Design an enzyme around this catalytic site. Structure first.
Site, PDB file in Angstrom:
ATOM      1  N   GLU A  43      -3.584 -15.026   0.318  1.00 44.35           N
ATOM      2  CA  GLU A  43      -3.115 -13.761   0.461  1.00 44.35           C
ATOM      3  C   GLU A  43      -2.893 -13.383   2.142  1.00 44.35           C
ATOM      4  O   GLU A  43      -1.803 -13.318   2.545  1.00 44.35           O
ATOM      5  CB  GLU A  43      -3.890 -12.751  -0.245  1.00 44.35           C
TER       6      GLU A  43
ATOM      7  N   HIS B  49     -12.210 -13.289  -2.875  1.00 50.20           N
ATOM      8  CA  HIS B  49     -12.583 -11.975  -2.214  1.00 50.20           C
ATOM      9  C   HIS B  49     -13.933 -11.483  -3.071  1.00 50.20           C
ATOM     10  O   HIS B  49     -13.734 -11.438  -4.057  1.00 50.20           O
ATOM     11  CB  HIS B  49     -11.520 -10.923  -2.652  1.00 50.20           C
TER      12      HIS B  49
ATOM     13  N   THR C 282      -5.024  -5.340  -2.690  1.00 45.41           N
ATOM     14  CA  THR C 282      -3.954  -6.383  -2.525  1.00 45.41           C
ATOM     15  C   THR C 282      -3.250  -6.090  -3.799  1.00 45.41           C
ATOM     16  O   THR C 282      -2.270  -7.205  -4.232  1.00 45.41           O
ATOM     17  CB  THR C 282      -4.104  -7.751  -2.064  1.00 45.41           C
TER      18      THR C 282
ATOM     19  N   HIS D  19      -7.541 -15.542  -5.504  1.00 43.63           N
ATOM     20  CA  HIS D  19      -5.989 -16.000  -5.746  1.00 43.63           C
ATOM     21  C   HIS D  19      -5.802 -17.139  -5.294  1.00 43.63           C
ATOM     22  O   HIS D  19      -6.346 -17.946  -4.499  1.00 43.63           O
ATOM     23  CB  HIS D  19      -5.350 -14.796  -4.638  1.00 43.63           C
TER      24      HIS D  19
ATOM     25  N   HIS E 295      -4.723 -11.029 -14.410  1.00 42.65           N
ATOM     26  CA  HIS E 295      -4.235 -11.321 -13.099  1.00 42.65           C
ATOM     27  C   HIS E 295      -5.113 -12.249 -12.311  1.00 42.65           C
ATOM     28  O   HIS E 295      -4.666 -12.788 -11.453  1.00 42.65           O
ATOM     29  CB  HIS E 295      -3.877 -10.244 -12.311  1.00 42.65           C
TER      30      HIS E 295
ATOM     31  N   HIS F 168     -13.560 -12.649  -6.886  1.00 37.17           N
ATOM     32  CA  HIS F 168     -12.346 -13.117  -7.548  1.00 37.17           C
ATOM     33  C   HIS F 168     -11.386 -13.788  -6.462  1.00 37.17           C
ATOM     34  O   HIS F 168     -11.938 -13.836  -5.538  1.00 37.17           O
ATOM     35  CB  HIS F 168     -11.532 -12.011  -8.191  1.00 37.17           C
TER      36      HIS F 168
HETATM   37 ZN   LIG Z   1      -8.353 -10.149  -4.203  1.00 39.31          ZN
END
Ligand SMILES: [Zn+2]
EC number: 4.2.1.1
Length: 257
Positions: free
Chosen positions: A103, A116, A195, A93, A61, A91
């Site tokens: 996010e 994050h 999240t 997104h 992911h 990591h």
């Molecule tokens: Zn995250």
């Protein structure tokens, strides 16, 4: 089971993780008209000179850079936090296009990506115990916009070709997470959640006002990763972000005027 597909993405997570409908879910939109300056908020303190990165992993992911969190080698203190939080992993997104990927949003604005930096409270003695507590985690969230290259990101970008598919990992030592910070550490903070599933409501969110700039070339390397494992049909790892969730009863505080 869960992912970011039409069939298994954020709209469906509540089926197996019913806290997805809870009172403190993340991310949120940050409305700068209502997220008031709070002059009592302290500055953030990061002590990262002893940070010890270990490995980088594609978990299907995102990719995580994992740290040695056995001692206070890389700690976040101050800001809204009581006590000491150890860095365990960071990591990102990101989006399929530059106009989406973050996010958190700011007055509904989406950034190209969001970093994050995940820390856990040494009050609790390990990450698994921490995630069970409302004050267990502190996640430092940093927006990415596309512009000039980020020098401190290049070491990460240069190894992504070695972890293309789910389950692949590589040694990744001597990475300095200070190299991913913006110049200002002005922030917003609110209580929220992981999240991704299990979506536990254990996070003090600290979201920086100032984005970092990354180059088109750097973020394009992110978008070449795969959600799938080796030997499965290609599914590019893009749009691995959860959209804004209801703020409900919560207050977002700003550290800055
Ligand atoms: Zn995250």
């Amino acid at each position: 089971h869960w992912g970011y597909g039409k069939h298994n993405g954020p709209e469906h997570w509540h089926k197996d993780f019913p806290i997805a409908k809870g009172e403190r879910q993340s991310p949120v939109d940050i409305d700068t008209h209502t997220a008031k300056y709070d002059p009592s908020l302290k500055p953030l303190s990061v002590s990262y000179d002893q940070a010890t990165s270990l490995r980088i992993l594609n978990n299907g992911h995102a990719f995580n850079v994992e740290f040695d969190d056995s001692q206070d080698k890389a700690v976040l203190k101050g800001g809204p936090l009581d006590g000491t939080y150890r860095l365990i992993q960071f990591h990102f997104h990101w989006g399929s296009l530059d106009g989406q990927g973050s996010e958190h949003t700011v007055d509904k604005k989406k950034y190209a990506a969001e970093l994050h930096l995940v820390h856990w409270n040494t009050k609790y003695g390990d990450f698994g115990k921490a995630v069970q507590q409302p004050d267990g985690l502190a996640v430092l969230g940093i927006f990415l916009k596309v512009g000039s290259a980020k020098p401190g990101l290049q070491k990460v970008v240069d190894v992504l070709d070695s972890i293309k598919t789910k389950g692949k990992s590589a040694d990744f030592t001597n990475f300095d997470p200070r190299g991913l910070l913006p110049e200002s550490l002005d922030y917003w903070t609110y209580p929220g959640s992981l999240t991704t599933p299990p979506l536990l409501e254990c996070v003090t969110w600290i979201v920086l006002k100032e984005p970092i700039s990354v180059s088109s070339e750097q973020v394009l390397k992110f978008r070449k990763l795969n959600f799938n494992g080796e030997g499965e049909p290609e599914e590019l790892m893009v749009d691995n972000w959860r959209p804004a969730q209801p703020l409900k009863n919560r207050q977002i505080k700003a550290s800055f005027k």
